[PDB]
Amino acid sequence: KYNLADAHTHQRQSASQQSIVSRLPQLWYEAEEGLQATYEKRFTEAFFQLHRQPTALVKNKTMLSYAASISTMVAGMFLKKERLAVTLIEPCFDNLYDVLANMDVPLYPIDESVFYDVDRIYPELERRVRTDALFLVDPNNPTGFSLLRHGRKGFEEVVRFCKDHDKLLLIDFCFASFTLFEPELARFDMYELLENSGVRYLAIEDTGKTWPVQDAKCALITASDDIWETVYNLHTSVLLNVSPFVLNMLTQYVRDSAADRLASVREVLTRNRECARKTLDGSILEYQEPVVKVSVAWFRVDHPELTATDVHRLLSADGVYVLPGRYFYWSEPSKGDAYVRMALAREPEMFADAMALTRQVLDR
Amino acid sequence: KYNLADAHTHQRQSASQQSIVSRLPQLWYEAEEGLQATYEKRFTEAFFQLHRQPTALVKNKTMLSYAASISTMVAGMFLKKERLAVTLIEPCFDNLYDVLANMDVPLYPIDESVFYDVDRIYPELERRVRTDALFLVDPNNPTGFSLLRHGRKGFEEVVRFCKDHDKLLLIDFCFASFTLFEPELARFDMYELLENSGVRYLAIEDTGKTWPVQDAKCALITASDDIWETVYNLHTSVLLNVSPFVLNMLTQYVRDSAADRLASVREVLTRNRECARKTLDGSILEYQEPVVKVSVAWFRVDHPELTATDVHRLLSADGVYVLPGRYFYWSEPSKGDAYVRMALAREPEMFADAMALTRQVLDR
Secondary structure, eight states: OEEOSOOSOOOOOOHHHHHHHHTHHHHHHHHHHSOHHHHHHHHHHHHHHHTTOHHHHHHOOOEEESOHHHHHHHHHHHHHHTTOOEEEEESOOHHHHHHHHHTTOOEEEEEGGGGSSGGGHHHHHHHHOOSSEEEEESSOTTTOOOGGGGTTHHHHHHHHHHHHTTOEEEEEOTTGGGGTTOTTTOOOOHHHHHHHHTOOEEEEEESTTTSOSTTOOOEEEEEOTTTHHHHHHHHHHHOSOOOHHHHHHHHHHHHHHHHTTTHHHHHHHHHHHHHHHHHHTTSSEEEOOOSSOOSEEEEEEOOSSOOHHHHHHHHHHTTEEOEEGGGTOOSOGGGGGGEEEEEOOSOHHHHHHHHHHHHHHHHO | OEEOSOOSOOOOOOHHHHHHHHTHHHHHHHHHHSOHHHHHHHHHHHHHHHTTOHHHHHHOOOEEESOHHHHHHHHHHHHHHTTOOEEEEESOOHHHHHHHHHTTOOEEEEEGGGGSSGGGHHHHHHHHOOSSEEEEESSOTTTOOOGGGGTTHHHHHHHHHHHHTTOEEEEEOTTGGGGTTOTTTOOOOHHHHHHHHTOOEEEEEESTTTSOSTTOOOEEEEEOTTTHHHHHHHHHHHOSOOOHHHHHHHHHHHHHHHHTTTHHHHHHHHHHHHHHHHHHTTSSEEEOOOSSOOSEEEEEEOOSSOOHHHHHHHHHHTTEEOEEGGGTOTTOGGGGGGEEEEEOOSOHHHHHHHHHHHHHHHTO
């Protein structure tokens, strides 16, 4: 009855978002009469204006695809062509591991904790990264961790390591919208740093996890200049273009959220996050406070005998579906037996009823 | 500027399709409140009812993705996991070659002419298919050729060969809509044959080339029972779901075309096909009549010196963009300098103006 598993957005539209919905027929006919490149440009401009990445608009080399996983498969084709193995963040949503493993990319974990202490990032990477590519997810799914806890310096140390040691840096920024307008955490211009450093890089951005667009979405990939041509040709074999109708619609959502400083996104997540925290405080599910207020909540199982598999089974029996941590510790899923993830992009009334039932199950 | 290059649909909405566009707000709220599985089921049912493939609905194992190229990349991941080489139809749109080559799938051509004589199909395949997999496109892009010119027997001979000789049979059916309601060519239930034969297969179907949905589309892939679980797991690493809003909208286009027996699609393509045929009769572009009335027209260059590359250069200098045949002879692009492809999925007024200009340029 209560799906708290997939992180996809299932909350309803805000009042101003209902006005976008009412304009869908005009957005359709506009895209029919206009030029594909016009809608690509207007979308990319609106997106990187909201995210405050002006360097990306100056370079104007970003490519659009149906979804972040499709951008990731383009990166996977590049990794295979260049015989690159990947050191990948753990924990991480395991579909990322799976799609790269299904492309036969060799994969080795690096634990998130190597990034907790800014002055240990570089020596820890020198000791632990023994592949020619490093794949990070920032802010991380499921933990909400971000190098932005360190200001600029955390990302600067990662980039310094990769440049010094001739590593390809891949970064999935799908959750970066949840840093925006934060006084201390708002993302700086990452593309300025990536370009200035000369590091080889692939950077993936997303709309699907931010807005309630029913997965009618677009992802963005940007490559360093030295691999841009190869990556462009890989990308064009996947698709010619994203729907200009979808691009037109998404541009309205981006502009709407610039106008309200992402309030309609943030307020829904905050309501459910606080309801989860208050309802489960003192329960066997121990809330793990995230660096960034992302759209998922992460819990440690605090019980002498019960594991995350048990909590998963017990909640499922009563109609509440969460995800056990084995789906995020992809290199040794046994490590995930102490954690559970819950989705927060939900209607607050259904979420609050799910939390009431969850606490009743956990108590029994 | 007259874009007759991309085969994507750019004709406008019919009177009844305008009533779908007008209801996009309602279709949005339906998908928002409803279950994802509902919109998957209703789309798949509408699609295979229109295409008259009842066996596919009985088996109920078809998976949905953003686009036919994404389904193809899932097939490519299977081909790479099994380390199989592919014998691929030639000519064919070279994006299919490109995406499989970019996944390092070994690719060897087989000319379309092996399928022209039904009584020679099996011995020609025995001689020429010396890989473990055979990949066909039927009806073919760019030629409109189809084994359906042989009724059931052409496909039955291909399937007999692949079963007898333990070949994986991959078929791209994206142009199959253009056979529907044809008195002699309408596709039979392909999945009845594929299932009954026990052949190992991957079958890809598409919406994007049929309807004017501005590339807000959905593709379908179906695998034989013996590889279904592997392919399912590969597919789920790519995406969890297609937008239920897009599925709901597409379902309305499918039902609309069931109601008019695809007249609003067929009549536009026929008008432009006839215009091209009449306009270019006797010119250096020699029309190649297709088996199936597909959305592209194919011409042979009839000149002692000029190539398709020359023709493309001359037409584009005056604003008419066609595709040289080099983009379809993927194993030997020079073979394609004898041919040109033109897109027909276009507003007829624009197309007729393009044709008048094309003949004016050619007559010089």
